[PDB]
């Protein structure tokens, strides 16, 4: 509860260099942890030149004790820096360089072998970097404690596998400080999923050592497992990750600490929805030019986003389910048409000729309509000025009839709009395209489900859909994320904070979290697919049922659903989720050296 001397050290590889989602977590955790630990909040992270200049303002030590520590570290051939990260909460950051590897080979690495009976191969860059980072962090905190008046309470919070070398050493060197190790993902889990046929059900069966060795990832696994065993308190991002940790690391998580996002989505919630849908609607009109028999107010947009993974984000399940939805919409006649946007980022050369031309024709038609509109404007104004209702036939001059005739000639096409927006450098290989062809969704006139795959992260610079990810997300009606393995659903979480209803799965961490925290997922607009306890085909059928239910929702009902989701943002806010880590931190102090601070669980 109360920290007399406690100092919080959130040690992570992604403090200063954006490499993965962990970086967003820290950048977002920093504000709330800032309040609880005050100026005792120190971030231990790798130095990146580009990172430091853009994000960090260099500073001097607040504490004379710290000054001594910084000086000592600087002295013995290490180039540690201290500064204030300019992110919210202004945390003090100690960014040590991993470029100062003066003695790392056969001295630091040598030591690690004697201490933890672990070795890192020369070729692996990430582990080699992490050993340097780990040793430096252990040295820093050990030196700090020694040079300063002894604070019985410090907390070092290690937030990833590669920061875990430090935790192994810290506990081994018998430094008197409680350390929390948090696995935002299981290392072996990522490889085992997709790599193996049935990762989830055979969790217990798998001989972790054998699998890890087989993938030449054994050193990394050993480090992750060592860190887990070493930590007094072990935390995991989600309950699903906890199940993985129990079997793969052979250690139950002591506490499960969910990831959170700050609400910066307010800058509305419905106005932005409308504006975004309009922009999306413009792209659709352009892309489908000439084959615009679909009612464009009745059309619903569904999207799947994130990094590029076919198995992990279960794009296959979404595509199979879309084919089944197409069948249902065809057999039972619906004015509504579904447009599915797959925004997974594959290799692209340029916008496809057809796609670019489509957008250009939309531009031409809009420009023409403007020219004719202005001329009608003048003629109407002139006609009104004389006191006569416009004689409609005479309003349009022969000059425009030619311009408009040319415009309607441009629209004419007999070829279905392309299934991708970008010309793919590698087309035939593309899993999404192969599946679209197999599934039979070729954007045919007859089809009620139209699939548009945008393989580039949506950008302001891009000519088509020149909206950034957040704005596009706001425009879409629904977001479908049938994730198989990906631990915490950062993308689904963002969607829900925005108020887009989002399909999640039991296998996704965000999905499991929502099930635990919400008695009915469906009512609040977050659908849960039970992919853990269902077969693949039955899961697809379940998704089809969800998608179809959404399609057959009344306009008013959908509005209600959206508004309900906007309430679920608080579940993912750091304010509420701050409780879980604070609990972990307090528990850490108690696990070792309990005499100074002992606090009993709520």
């Amino acid at each position: 509860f109360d920290l007399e001397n406690a100092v919080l050290f959130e040690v992570a590889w992604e403090v200063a260099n954006k490499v993965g989602g962990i970086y967003t977590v820290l950048q977002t955790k920093a504000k709330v942890t800032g309040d609880e630990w005050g100026d005792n909040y120190f971030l231990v992270g790798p130095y990146t030149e580009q990172g430091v200049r853009t994000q960090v303002e260099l500073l001097e030590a607040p504490t004379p004790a710290l000054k001594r520590t910084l000086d000592s570290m600087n002295s013995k051939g290490c180039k540690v820096y201290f500064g204030r990260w300019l992110i919210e909460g202004g945390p003090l950051v100690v960014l040590l360089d991993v470029g100062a590897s003066a003695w790392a080979l056969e001295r630091w690495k040598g030591e690690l072998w004697d201490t933890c009976n672990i070795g890192v191969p020369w070729y692996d860059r990430e582990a080699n970097d992490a050993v340097l980072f780990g040793f430096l962090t252990t040295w820093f905190l050990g030196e700090f404690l020694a040079q300063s008046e002894e604070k019985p309470h410090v907390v070092a919070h290690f937030h990833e596998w590669l920061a875990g070398v430090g935790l192994c050493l810290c506990r081994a060197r018998r430094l008197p400080v409680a350390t929390i190790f948090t696995t935002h993902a299981t290392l072996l889990g990522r490889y085992l999923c997709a790599g193996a046929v049935d990762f989830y059900n055979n969790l217990e069966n798998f001989n972790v050592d054998k699998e890890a060795g087989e993938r030449q990832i054994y050193h990394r696994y050993c480090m992750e497992r060592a860190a887990a065993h070493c930590a007094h308190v072990f935390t995991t991002v989600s309950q699903i990750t906890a199940i993985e940790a129990q079997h793969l690391l052979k250690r139950k998580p002591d506490i499960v600490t969910p990831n959170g996002l700050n609400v910066k989505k307010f800058s509305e919630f419905q106005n932005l929805h409308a504006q975004s849908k309009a922009r999306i609607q413009e792209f659709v009109r352009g892309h489908f030019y000439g084959h615009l028999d679909f009612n464009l107010d009745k059309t619903l947009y569904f999207f799947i986003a994130g990094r590029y993974e076919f198995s992990n984000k279960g794009a296959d399940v979404f595509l199979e389910a879309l084919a089944r939805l197409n069948y249902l919409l065809r057999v039972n006649g619906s004015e509504q048409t579904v447009v599915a946007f797959f925004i997974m980022p594959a290799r692209t050369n340029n916008f496809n000729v057809e796609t670019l031309k489509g957008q250009a024709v939309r531009k031409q038609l809009w420009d023409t309509a403007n020219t004719v509109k202005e001329k009608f404007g003048r003629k109407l104004y002139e006609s009104l000025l004389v006191g006569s209702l416009p004689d409609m036939n005479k309003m349009l001059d022969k000059e425009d009839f030619t311009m408009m005739k040319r415009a309607i000639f441009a629209t004419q096409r007999q070829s279905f709009p392309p299934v991708c927006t970008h010309n793919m450098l590698d087309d035939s290989s593309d899993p999404i395209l192969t599946t679209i062809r197999r599934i039979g969704l070729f954007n045919s006139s007859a089809d009620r489900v139209k699939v548009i795959f945008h393989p580039e992260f949506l950008s302001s610079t891009s000519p088509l859909l020149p909206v950034d990810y957040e704005e596009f997300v706001r425009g879409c009606h629904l977001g479908v994320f049938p994730s198989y393995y990906e631990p915490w659903g950062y993308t689904p979480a963002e969607c829900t904070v925005m108020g887009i209803p989002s399909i999640s799965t039991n296998l996704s961490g965000f999905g499991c979290f929502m099930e635990e925290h919400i008695a009915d997922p469906s009512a609040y607009g977050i659908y849960i697919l039970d992919r853990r306890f269902r077969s693949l085909d039955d899961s697809c059928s379940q998704l089809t049922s969800f998608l179809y239910s959404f399609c057959q929702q009344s306009r008013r009902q959908r509005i209600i659903q959206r508004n309900r989701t906007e309430r679920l943002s608080d579940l993912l806010d750091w304010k509420y989720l701050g409780r879980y880590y604070m609990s972990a931190r307090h528990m850490a102090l108690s696990k070792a050296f309990p005499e100074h601070f002992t606090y009993e669980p709520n």
Partner: protein
């Protein structure tokens, strides 16, 4: 899925070994559908018993029998015995949809996807790519369709002189009507197409789902050495044929010795 089946035709013991391999390959890739051979009287009793170990139903068809629906047609067209036997696939009205596969095909991956396609969805034929290779075709059993096919058999027969000819004449819509009715050639990869235009098999061969051994030397006929899984042709990739011979040796010779031969 009791409602849907892969069908295949065995006209002798030779094409029974083919069917045994096809059937095994469908099992290996874990079809949820029934396996339903059609056997002429010519298949020995001992071979039918081997067929029973692989196929859910071994259905006897004898066009020489005067009770057979095609018998009158056979008397008009005595050269089309095999074809009229194959066309009995349409009589299997216990099934709402089937995939017919010639006994000289081999499955390389799960193709329950074929059941998505509707009546006469077949891979474009190498050579005339406006005719549908009748090696693999999705169809819906019907007495009416069957009778119409027999009528066509009597009246005009087949331009090819085989099942491909008569099916093409009747289902002429395939060439132009719908692109959903064009199965990817991967679902019926006549080896001759790999051999004739090898550059393409190189890039789109990896994705092959069904290989069809259309050649002078049938897969059972080829000589096989178990020592290195070796074979002594349009079979440019000998890999597909190696996968025929292995499947045979592993999962048939046992079921073969067990019932004779």
């Amino acid at each position: 899925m009791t409602d849907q089946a892969f069908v295949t035709l065995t006209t002798n013991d030779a094409y029974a070994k083919g069917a045994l391999v096809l059937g095994s390959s469908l099992k290996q890739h874990r079809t949820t559908r029934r396996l339903v051979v059609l056997a002429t009287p010519q298949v020995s009793d001992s071979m039918r018993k081997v067929l029973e170990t692989v196929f859910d139903e071994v259905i006897m068809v004898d066009v020489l029998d005067s009770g057979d629906s095609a018998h009158l047609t056979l008397m008009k067209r005595p050269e089309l015995g095999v074809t009229l036997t194959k066309l009995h696939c349409w009589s299997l009205t216990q099934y709402s949809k089937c995939v017919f596969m010639d006994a000289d095909t081999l499955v390389l991956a799960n193709i329950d996807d074929l059941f998505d396609r509707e009546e006469l969805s077949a891979a474009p034929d190498p050579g005339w790519p406006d005719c549908f290779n009748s090696g693999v075709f999705v169809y819906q059993p019907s007495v009416e369709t069957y009778n119409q096919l027999l009528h066509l058999a009597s009246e005009q027969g087949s331009f090819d002189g085989g099942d491909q000819g008569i099916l093409n004449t009747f289902f002429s819509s395939w060439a132009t009507t719908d692109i959903r009715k064009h199965l990817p050639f991967i679902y019926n990869l006549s080896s001759i197409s790999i051999f004739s235009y090898l550059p393409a098999f190189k890039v789109f061969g990896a994705s092959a789902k069904v290989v069809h051994f259309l050649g002078r030397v049938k897969p059972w006929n080829y000589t096989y050495d178990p020592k290195t899984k070796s074979v002594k042709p349009n079979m440019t990739h000998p890999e597909f044929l190696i996968l025929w011979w292995n499947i045979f040796t592993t999962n048939v010779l046992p079921l073969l010795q067990q019932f004779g031969l």
